[PDB]
Point group: C3
Chain length 231, copies 3
């Protein structure tokens, strides 16, 4: 395990996701409100899935070698397995907060699936120049998602409770900033142009992942917006 | 890319799915009705997914070699990845049109999953005679789906709005004819008996795919059946 | 096929799932009640999926070799493909019976996904001692599911119809006993410590699978709890 310099960040990531999972699990024990239960379920599952995939990367299972540029390049494929399930759960948290219509939710989840799926294909593609074609398609799917979060959701939040409108606005802003960093790190890291070494890349993704999951969850689950308006 | 004679049909397929995706995306921009949004979301996602998988076939990612009959046989596995997601979306379009009950929808999607999954296993099976066992099981799942579309849905459409009944009937008929061709092409093509060469097989699937997705979508999204009855 | 001593149990399993599938399919033909249709759909799909995966194991497709302990160890990976889809369907049968809230259903299905997914990783892991780390995480996800079935569902059933409360209690008890045997068989069988040989392991899983699917389904589909209260 320690044979890879990036192991320290995989281990820290595993620990922080594990701790985040346990914290949300305990916190949600005292919850009976049916609406709050939905948000706790979604939000606890996110770091639990990430915990398993960080562990698989730490132990070496979630790593494969991909030939491109005349080299055997270490590619952590387990990231995409994580993201396939956790990024639509994160979007679902946002969509339920603002009572999004079903068509909009399906558009978001579908675009998200395309985003992660094409990122996976790009990560595993052996023809170097083609990796960036997949990156571009994935990034276009991301831009669609960000567009919807701003010009379909923000003006939906404003007709809702003030506490859900303010909580949505904060989580929207956190999401757009954090999620936009992922394609940049991929592009300059070992999957793309290879300018930033894998150990630093792994650190960067770990900070983004913990912030986008445990950070996000801490903000959401401390808000009164997750509860039905009750006396 | 041009090293494979079937590349021209993969390229045309990619282009037509891409163009179809953009057309539906633009067309649905001016839509606020919650019901119509569902149909636009579902129907736009279908060629978008197909676009990505056609591209993966064009670039060579979605192709593998399978030993059977003492030969290395080129198998485009990306078709099944496409179909796994797009065929239940197509069925969902039909089921929502007639306000199908939840049990019926689950039966359809489940049978569809079995249909595509067993087709994939058959496509990748190395014992030649066993490929046709999987083809038979998949075809039985197809026949179940077609049965339900006729003797569970058609008489559901007739108690609904005339515009939804007439639109459903047309899309049902398009679906049954087009979908029934797929097992025949598989059986006589490079996956099955090998009587029709891969380049012609690829052409045939491209015509079926564009018709079943973009053709289907053009009929559906031009109907007033996708809108709630409103003043 | 007969080259593997466990083939007889794979063949019997295939037959019993096939027969169970046909029986439930015929039985549900005379059903119009929308609630009952849901239970028939879910419950018929379960042995149908299991039939396909038992067949893939019989024909040899669903088997791979995994190096650990200095040996090539036969691992039937198709079990996890089965279980990935059938165990959440089984939980859905239980959850719908007691009209579980959406948050609880998502927690169950999510924990179940983690349970099966980590079992799959453990089954395919090449470092022997690490296989048991994945077994432990999977078992913890199982224990969560069993906890919810007892201390979240049982007291939900009691405020419902007596026929649904009594049917739920029986199916809950069947589920907890049968499902708890699976991690034990894995641990002592060819995936784990290797004390029980593969042919006996295969027998054990076949008895558990038929009981947990066809047995379970026979109890559920003969109950009046699956019908809406109607005059
Ligand atoms: C009911 O609605 C609220 C339940 O949501 C909360 C439900 C949770 C989503 C349940 C899912 C967590 C499972 C219990 C997962 C089990 C293994 C976990 C990964 C635990 C890992 C952390 C520990 C090992 C440090
Ligand atoms: C509604 C939304 C969910 C829409 C989803 C959007 C989605 C369509 C976007 C594209 C997804 C698609 C790229 C998934 C591809 C998975 C694939 C990378 C798995 C690895 O297999 C690739 C090659 C080795 O590189 O296998 C070597 C050759 C092997 C023989 C491969 C044969 C097995 C195939 C992988 C079977 C395909 C199954 C499905 C792709 C399962 C989807 C997995 C998940 C990653 C989407
Ligand atoms: C809101 O409900 C309506 C939105 O549906 C319409 C929503 C669409 C389903 C959004 C999904 C499309 C994504 C934007 C996919 C991005 C890449 C596409 C494959 C674009 C490819 C076509 C172009 C490259 C020729
Ligand atoms: C409700 C509905 C959805 C019901 C669904 C119906 C469904 C049950 C029908 C059968 C689906 C099942 C056949 C999927 C099999 C996928 C498999 C072909 C992927 C390729 O792996 C096959 C061999 C190489 O040929 O791998 C070589 C050996 C490797 C070590 C394989 C180990 C990895 C396994 C593939 C893990 C299994 C994961 C699940 C099958 C994911 C499902 C993928 C999708 C195609 C259904
Ligand atoms: C409508 O709601 C009730 C339908 O549920 C019942 C619907 C069923 C879930 C339909 C799914 C079964 C498909 C017809 C599967 C076809 C192949 C089967 C595996 C048949 C195998 C058994 C036989 C070959 C012995
Ligand atoms: C809401 C709930 C559903 C939550 C779900 C919980 C879930 C997160 C729990 C963990 C699931 C995760 C372990 C699935 C891993 C599948 C993996 C074993 C498939 C086989 O690939 C493993 C190695 C060979 O051993 O591939 C060799 C290297 C290859 C290059 C691998 C590259 C292809 C990757 C497999 C692509 C990943 C796609 C997704 C994992 C699809 C999920 C399949 C299913 C088994 C969950
Ligand atoms: C918890 C993990 C999260 C929130 C991950 C988010 C990841 C993305 C938004 C990834 C986006 C990518 C692209 C837009 C193109 C390049 C490849 C990706 C997959 C890194
Ligand atoms: C957009 C793509 C569509 C509508 C594809 C439909 C495909 C089928 C109905 C495929 C059916 C098959 C069988 C019935 C058995 C042989 C294998 C298949 C998968 C080709
Ligand atoms: C129809 C099949 C059923 C009901 C299978 C149930 C399987 C399980 C509950 C498996 C549990 C496992 C663990 C808890 C850890 C070890 C690995 C598994 C996957 C066997
Ligand atoms: C969105 C953030 C992307 C920028 C990442 C900056 C990383 C700077 C680290 C120094 C680069 C290491 C190069 C020498 C090894
Ligand atoms: C459902 C349509 C299946 C029939 C396809 C007919 C294809 C005819 C093309 C000629 C066959 C090529 C054989 C000589 C290369
Ligand atoms: C939950 C049941 C697990 C116990 C399984 C008992 C199997 C006993 C069979 C005898 C073991 C075979 C060892 C000699 C080959
Ligand atoms: C490819 C995996 C996509 C599914 C991820 C799980 C999250 C799905 C959330 C469903 C949202 C509800 C839509 C109506
Ligand atoms: C194996 C992939 C199956 C899922 C495909 C996505 C479409 C699912 C549509 C869900 C229909 C709603 C059922 C209640
Ligand atoms: C990884 C596969 C998980 C999906 C299995 C299919 C069963 C899903 C049942 C959905 C229950 C409804 C939740 C709201
Ligand atoms: C186009 C929608 C406006 C809100 C999205 C902001 C786009 C940020 C760009 C992210 C950088 C990705 C490379
Ligand atoms: C049995 C249901 C009647 C409607 C379905 C028509 C079946 C068409 C056969 C398709 C050919 C597949 C090989
Ligand atoms: C902790 C919840 C109480 C009900 C679950 C009973 C646990 C049975 C243990 C199963 C054995 C697995 C190794
Ligand atoms: C070796 C790099 C070749 C450049 C490929 C860039 C493709 C980016 C596509 C953006 C439309
Ligand atoms: C393919 C990228 C699309 C980003 C711009 C959004 C187009 C308008 C969509 C309106 C729902
Ligand atoms: C080499 C071909 C052997 C014939 C197999 C046909 C099987 C079809 C099954 C239909 C019930
Ligand atoms: C070779 C076996 C080494 C023992 C591993 C047991 C790990 C079990 C983890 C339970 C917390
Ligand atoms: C509760 C702490 C969980 C941390 C387990 C994984 C950390 C890796 C240590 C090497
Ligand atoms: C908008 C046109 C999209 C076409 C891109 C793929 C066509 C392949 C050209 C070689
Ligand atoms: C209807 C009987 C189904 C049995 C088919 C599979 C049994 C395997 C026989 C070798
Ligand atoms: C993006 C950083 C999130 C910070 C989380 C802090 C949570 C405290 C309530
Ligand atoms: C099956 C062929 C479909 C033809 C689509 C034409 C759409 C015009 C409205
Ligand atoms: C766990 C054993 C189940 C027994 C099923 C018998 C069904 C008869 C109604
Ligand atoms: C990591 C366990 C958290 C302890 C409880 C925190 C207050 C709910
Ligand atoms: C008003 C919300 C500001 C949140 C910005 C957080 C940036 C990481
Ligand atoms: C809305 C601001 C987006 C900031 C992008 C930051 C990418 C590192
Ligand atoms: C391909 C872009 C379509 C242009 C608009 C067509 C009329 C909505
Ligand atoms: C009355 C509907 C006829 C549609 C037939 C289309 C055949 C491709
Ligand atoms: C309902 C008519 C079906 C026609 C099947 C055509 C197969 C090529
Ligand atoms: C296996 C076929 C079952 C025959 C009908 C049983 C009574 C519904
Ligand atoms: C009162 C229900 C008892 C069911 C026990 C079944 C054990 C297999
Ligand atoms: C509730 C009793 C569980 C029995 C476990 C049996 C495991 C073989």
């Amino acid at each position: 395990i320690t044979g890879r310099p990036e192991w320290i960040w995989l281990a820290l990531g595993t620990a922080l996701m594990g701790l985040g999972t346990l914290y949300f699990l305990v916190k949600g024990m005292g919850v009976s409100d049916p609406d709050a239960k939905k948000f706790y379920a979604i939000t606890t599952l996110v770091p639990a899935i990430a915990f398993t995939m960080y562990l698989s990367m730490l132990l070496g299972y979630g790593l494969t070698m991909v030939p491109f540029g005349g080299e055997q390049n270490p590619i952590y494929w387990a990231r995409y397995a994580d993201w396939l399930f956790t990024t639509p759960l994160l979007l679902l948290d946002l969509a339920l907060l603002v009572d999004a219509d079903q068509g909009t939710i399906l558009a978001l989840v579908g675009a998200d699936g395309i985003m992660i799926g094409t990122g996976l294909v790009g990560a595993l593609t052996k023809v170097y120049s083609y990796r960036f074609v997949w990156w571009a398609i994935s990034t276009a799917a991301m831009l669609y998602i960000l567009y919807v979060l701003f010009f379909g959701f923000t003006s939906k939040a404003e007709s809702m409770r003030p506490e859900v409108a303010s909580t949505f606005k904060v989580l929207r802003n956190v999401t757009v900033v954090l999620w936009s960093a992922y394609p940049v790190v991929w592009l300059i890291g070992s999957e793309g142009a290879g300018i930033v070494p894998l150990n630093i890349e792994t650190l960067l993704f770990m900070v983004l992942d913990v912030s986008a999951k445990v950070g996000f969850g801490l903000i959401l689950l401390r808000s009164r917006a997750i509860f039905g308006e009750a006396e």
